[model samples]
Target: KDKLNPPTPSIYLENKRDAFFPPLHQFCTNPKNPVTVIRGLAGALKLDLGLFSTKTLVEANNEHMVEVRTQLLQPADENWDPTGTKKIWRCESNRSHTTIAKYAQYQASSFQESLREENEKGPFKTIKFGTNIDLSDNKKWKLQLHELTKLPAFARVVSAGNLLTHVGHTILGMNTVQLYMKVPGSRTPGHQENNNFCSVNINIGPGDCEWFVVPEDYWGVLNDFCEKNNLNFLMSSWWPNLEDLYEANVPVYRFIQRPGDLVWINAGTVHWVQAVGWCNNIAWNVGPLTACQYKLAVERYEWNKLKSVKSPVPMVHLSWNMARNIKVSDPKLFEMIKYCLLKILKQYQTLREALVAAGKEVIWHGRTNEEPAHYCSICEVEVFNLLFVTNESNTQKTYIVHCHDCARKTSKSLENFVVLEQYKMEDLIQVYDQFTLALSLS
Candidate 1:
C-alpha cells in the first residue's frame, strides 16, 4: 500500500462566492484549503429564533427529539424529580443527533394554502433541543438541528442533476439548522470531519463556537494521543488530550464562527466544537467526489473500516460504476475520467485481493436479498466491476453504475452520458458457480 495520504484542510473564508449549492467543482478539483466559510449564507434560511423554544416543541407538531440534562444543577432540587441524585454531572445537552429543520414551503405548502382562510391556522412548531460537555447548567442547554434540503432553494440544489448535487449526494436530509439555548462553557468531541462528507456550516443566530480543527496529516498523531490517554475514538464523548497535540506541534486551525458566517469542512479535516453562547446554525453535507477527492475518500473509507462503520456513500463502488460509463465526447474529459478510473480500479484490485486472502466474502446489500441495489446504467444488469457510475444523474437517491462495453457503445459525450466499463455476461455464471459450490457444501 504505497498510498500517499491526501492533504489536510485549511480554514477558508468565502463571502461573495456563495449559494445554496456548494462549489463542488472547486472543492474537488483544486483547493488551497479544505474548509471555506460562506459569510452571508444565513440569509438563505431566513431563520427566526423567536419561533423556537421548549414550548414551541409541541406546537411544531413535527418530530422533536427532546434531550434533558441536569448535570450542572444542585444535587437535590425542588423542581427536579429525582432528589439527592448527583446525576453524574458528566455534562448537559450533548445530543447525539441533528434536529430536522422544517421547510417553510413544507410547513405551509400549496395543499395547506387550499384550506379555508378561517379553517384554523396551523399550530406553531417548536425546535427539537438537545447537548452537553464536561460541565453545564442543570437545564441541559444542548440542541442538534438538521434537514434543510426540503427548503425550496435547498431542494433545488440537491436535485440539480449535475456534478454539484452529485458530489453531495449523501443523506438527502442531513442538511438543516441548529439552535442552541443560552449555554455556558461547552466543547465538542473530536474526530475527522465526516465518515465520508464535506459539511457547510452556516451560523444563523447570535454567538459563536470556538472551533479547533486539526489537519488530516495529524490525524495519526491524534489517534496515538487517544491511545496514550485511553480515549475511545469511536465514542462521541471521548477526546484525546490537547497537551499532547500541543507538544506534537500539530497544525491546528482555531476560529470563532458567529452569526451570518459559515464554514465548509472537507473530508478528513479533524475538528471539535465548543459553544460561545446560545447559537443558531444551518449546515449541509456535500456528497459527490471526483478524482481530486478519490484519495481523501480512500482515507475516509479507512477510518470507517477501522471503526467497523459502513460509509453511507460508497464512492469507490460508484467510481467503478462511473468508469464503464465514460461516454463523454470531450477527449480531455474522457482522459481525465480514464485516469481517475484507472487509479480506482487499481485500488479495487488491491482491496479485493486482500479480502480474498483474508477469506472474506463480498457482502452486497441488494434490492432484495439476492439482487443488488446498483446496476449498469446502460446494460441494465446488476453491476459487478468498476466501470463508471453516475451520482450526478441518479434520479433514484441510491444511484446507478455502468459496464465497460456499454460505455464504449454509447455515442454521447461524457457530459451528455452517464457511466461505463466492462459488463461481462460470464460474471453471472461466476456468481452461479459460487452459489452452486455453496449448495454442494450444504
Candidate 2:
C-alpha cells in the first residue's frame, strides 16, 4: 500500500479523544461475515481525491488488481463434491455500485497476466454484483464489510457450512482477509477534520495477521501477483513498494476484511502476502507518480519532498509500521515517521506494459528455485504459494512464487528444504532466498 485516503472518512475523525490504538482495535465486525464496519464516516469528510473523490477512475498506475475471494474446488473424491467445480467466490457478488466495480476491475487488471483472457464490458458498461452462492453448499447469504483493529473478538469471517474455505487436494487454501486503516494520530490533525478518514489495518500475512508473521508475507504476495501476471502472462507489472524490505521499513496498520464485502487499499500503507487464501480486493494506488500522492488534503503542507527511485532498490523491514505505535505521537515524531516512510515509499510514473491475465491460464510453469503465483482471474493477489508441504516424502509437491504486478510463476525446489517456523513467512527461506513474497511491478 503506497498511499490511502478515506473514500469517505479517516477512521479517526469522530472519536478525537481516543485517537490511538483503542479506536483502531475497537473495530466492529459482522456476526455472520466477520468484518469491521464504520458506523459512519468519523466526521464530515469532503476532499478532492481526484478520481476517488468523484465517480471517475482510471486504471491504477501501479495497482495490484485482485479479487480476494473464497475458492471452492469440487470434491477431489467426486463423492465429496458432486458439482463439476466448487468455484471460488466473491462474497459481495450481489452488491451494486459503479465506484466499487470500477475499483475492482482496475485493481484486478493491474497484475501482469490478470487480464489476458477476460472480456471487457462492451460499452456504456457499469458492472454490478450478483448474489453470492456457496460453491459447495449452494446456499446464499447476506453480507457486511468494514474497517479494522478494535473489537470484542478480532474481526473474522464467520459463516456456517457456507463458510469460505480451502478445497481438498487443491494447491490453494483459505486465507483470512487482512485489513488496515489510516488514522490522524495527534501528529497531524489535518486529517482529524475528515470524519470519513478512519485508518484500520489488515496484515497480508504468514501468521494469519499475527504480529509474529513476517510483514513481508502479506507484502510479498503483492510481488507474486506482479510476477505471475507480468512474467507468465507477459503483462508489464511491478510493485514500487517492493524496494523497501532491506533499506527502510514501512508501517503496517492492522484491520479486518469481512467475508462478504470490499476494502479500500490506498497508496501509502505498503503490504504483501507470504501465504494464500480465497479473497477479493482492489489495490487502488492511482494517479501521476509524484510525491504528492503521499500528501493528503490533511497532510499536504507537511509533505514537501520525496526521494527519487534508484535501481537495486533495497529491502524493507517487517516492523516498519509497528514502530509507529510507539514512536509517533507529536509533530516532531510525525515528521520523522513521514521522512522515513517517504524514503521507502518512493514511486514515479512508468511506461505502460501489458500481459495476459495469469489466472486465465491453466498451467503456471516454473524452475526449481524460482517463484510461483496463483491469483484471481483478474491477476490480483490471492494465493502466491499455497503448496507449503515441506515433507520430504511428498515428492510430487511443487513450490511456486507469484509476481505482484503480473500473475507470473517462478520457483525452485525446497532442495534446501527447511521450514523456518510455524506460520512465520521469513522464518522459512529457500535455496538462495529462492522463494518468498517480494513486491512486484514485474
Candidate 3:
C-alpha cells in the first residue's frame, strides 16, 4: 500500500500463460501484483460437489451463512409443494447485504485464538465442515483434504503453507482451505479490509463472478465514499451504494472470471464480488509477512482493536516463533525475519499509550496472572514483562508487546495501533539468545 509499490494490477492470464508468472512467493512479497486470474484453467468441467454446491449450501438451513432466495417471499410449508415451481435469482447488488457465506465469518476463530488455544504446536489446524461420520452421505458430499491437493495450482501453494510452520513450531498462520458456495445472481456484501494473511482462491465453476477492485492507493476514495454513505468499510454487514461510488467518481477494476480460473487476493486490497451463477471455489490464507503484508497485519491489528477481535493469524506470534527457529541457516533469510520483527516491535509504546488512555477495563484469558498474558497488537507476541497497556477500544488487551524504542513511522499516530504489556531489554534479548542458542544446538 506504500507509494513505492502500488496495488498490484489484477492479473488475467490464460492457463497456458503459466510460463510468464512469478513463483507463488512473489505474489505475496509484491503488493502491486496481488490478484491474478487464469482463464478457463479448469474449464468445461462438471462437478458433483454435493452439499458444497450453491443449491444445497444455500437452502440446507434457513439460518445458514450462505443466502437463499425465492421470489415467492414465503417459506415453503410442509403442505406446500416446490415440485414444479420456477425459481430465479438476480445479481442486483454487489453482494451488499444478502448472503455472503464465509466459513469463519463473525468474530470467530481468529488466527491468534486458533494458535493460542494450542500449546507451542497449537497452530496446526484444518477447515473441517464435519467429520465423515458426522455427515449422512459422507461418500458424496464429504470434503477431503486430498480433494484440494488434487489441483496442481493448489499444490504449488502448499510450500507457502509449509513456510508458515517455520515461524511457529507446527503453527500455521494461514487459514485451512475451504470451499465457498457462490450462488447465481447472488452478490457478496461490498467492503474492504486486508485479510490478515495471503489468500489464494481457485474456481471450480460452471459460471463466473464479476470482481470490483479498488487499487490500494485509491483506497482512500473508497473509504471516503463509505464515510459519506454511513457505511463501515471494515464490516461486512453493510454495503455502500454503487451510485455513490459512481458519484464520488472513483476508478475501479472489473474482471470477469470463468471456470477453472484461479485468483490470488493479496493481504489488504479493497475488492467486492458478484457471482454470475452457481459456483464453487476453494480458498486458503497463510501468514507470510512481506513488506506489504506486514502493513496489512498492522491494519488488521488496528481493526481488531476497534472491533475487539483478533486476527485468525496474529503477526507478532508468528514473528516470535519464526525468529526463534534454529533451522534458519541462510544469512539472508535470517536477516529478513529479524527486520520484520523489529519493524512491528518499534511501534509498541505509542500504541499502548493510546489504549491505556481509553481506560477500558482489562481482562486476560487462559494465562496465569503473573505470566504476562497480554499480546502486542503489532507484533502478535504474548507479553511476559514490561508489557505496554491499552484498552481505549476494548476491555481485553491485544497480543501486541513492545518497549520504548518502538516508534511511529507513517503519518498514522500511535493511537491507531494498540497494545499489551511486557519485557525488559534483557528479557527481549532472550529471544536473540534463545534463537542463537538453538542455532548452536542444532
Candidate 4:
C-alpha cells in the first residue's frame, strides 16, 4: 500500500468568523495550528489593496530602481533530476536594474503574451523577472501603507510578541517588511526559513499564487529524501518533484493564496511557492519567544553548523541579550532560554580552560555596540564572547576569526595568534542569575 498520498488542503478561514478567528498570539504560537489561510482580511486591516496594483505601484514610485533576478524557464514536462541528465531552469545573476515603471510594463506585456499562447505545445524558454525588494526601512513606502504595520495579524503575533522587539534590532527579512514581485511560473523552491522563524505573507495582487507546504513533523523525512537523491537539503539549488514526495510517502499541503488573502506559515514548516499569475506579495518573518519557537531556532542553529552552512541568526548571542533585556513570564519559555544560556556557558568555560592549559595568551577586546555578531572564517560557526584571531599572512591589516577548535586546527603551535575576549565570566554569571531570579518569582 502507498503510504504517502496526494497533498492535503490547508485550513481556510473567513475574516469575520469569531469562532474561527482566535486571538492572533495564541493561534500563531500554538503548536497545533501549523498553517492557515484567512480570506477577506484587507478590509479588517483597513488596507487600500488597490495601492499594490502594478499601475498604482509604478505611479507611486516610478523613479525607485531595484535589482531583479532573471530566470530561464524550462519545458512544462521537464523535472529536475539528480543525475543532471535532464536540464532544469537556469538563472542569470548578472547585475540588472529596472525602475518600478519599467518592470511593471514588462509584467503587463509578459502576462498578455502568455495569454495569447494559452494552447502552446511547449513551455516558453522565456525569462521571468522576480525580486524581493526590501522596504523594511523605506520611509516613503511606509507612509504609503503604514496600515500594514498596524494590522492585528502583524502587531499581535509578531510586532508585539517577537523577542527581538525589546532589543530594537532590525533584522531585515526576519523582522522588516519586504515586497515580492513575480510573473507567472516564478517560484520559490522547497525550504524552511533560516533560524526557523514563522512567516506571514499577504498577497496584494492582480492574480493568485500556489503554495505547497510540508508540515514540521515530516521535515526529517524530506531531509532524508533529499539527501538520498543528492539534492541540496537547504533547497536553494533545486526544486522538489512533488510526485517523488508522494511515492516516498511525505504528506504535503497544497493551497492557493488569492488577493487580500493572509497566510500564516508556522515556524520550521518546509514550503514552496509559485506564482500562477503576475502578482505582488508582502511578507516578513517573526521570531516569537515561545519555547516551541526557540527550540526550533536553536536546533537549526546547531544543524547549520554541522552542515557547514552560515546560520543567519546568531541564536546564542541573541539569547543572552534577550535574557538581559526582557522579563519572561511563561515558565516554558524561561526554561528554554535558561537551558540555552547554561549550554553556551559550559562550552565557553571548557574552551577557556583548555586555552589556559595550553599557555595561549588572551586579550580583552570589549565592544561598545552589540549589533554585529562574529563567526568562524572556515566553519562559519557563530563565535560568542571569545574569538580566535589570526592575521592573513599576505595582508597586513586583514584578520581572520575562528572558533577555538578551528583555531587549533589551523595551527597547533598557536603562534602569531591572538585571542579576543569580549565579556568577563563574572558578568555573564551575574546576568544568568538575574534572569533566573526574576523569572522564578513570577
TM-score, cand. 2: 0.20
RMSD in order of candidates = 16.7, 23.6, 14.7, 4.2
Q: Give all TM-scores, in the order shown.
A: 0.52, 0.20, 0.54, 0.84
lDDT of 1: 0.44
lDDT of 1 at 392: 56
Tell me the tens digit of each residue's lDDT in model 2 across 1-442.
Answer: 4432112222433443333344443232111112233332222122111222111222322132222222222211111112323221111112222333444453344322334645441111122221111111112101112221122122223221111111111111111222211110000000111111112333221112211011212333433444544431111212222233222343333343322222322322232221122222212111111122223311411221121111110111211321322222334334543554444333200110111222211223222321222332233223222222223423444433232233222224333222111112232222113322234342
Q: After superposition, how far is residue 430 of candidate 2 from its true place, in Å?
A: 19
- TM-score-superior candidate, 2 or 4: 4
Candidate 4, backbone clash total: 1
Q: Flag regions of model 1 displaced more than 4 Å.
A: 1-30, 43-58, 66-182, 288-290, 320-442
Query: What lDDT does candidate 4 reach at residue 114?
Result: 82
Please write out the lDDT profile of model 4 over residues 289-312, one tens digit for every residue: 688888888899888877878888
* Candidate number with the higher TM-score (2 or 3): 3
Which tens-of-lDDT digit does each residue in 247-294 have in candidate 3?
A: 566555567776666666656656666566446666555544344555
Off by more than 4 A, model 3: 1-29, 43-143, 150-174, 193-196, 240-243, 246-249, 306-309, 326-428, 433-442
Candidate-wise lDDT, in order: 0.44, 0.24, 0.46, 0.72
Among these predictions, the greatest TM-score belongs to 4
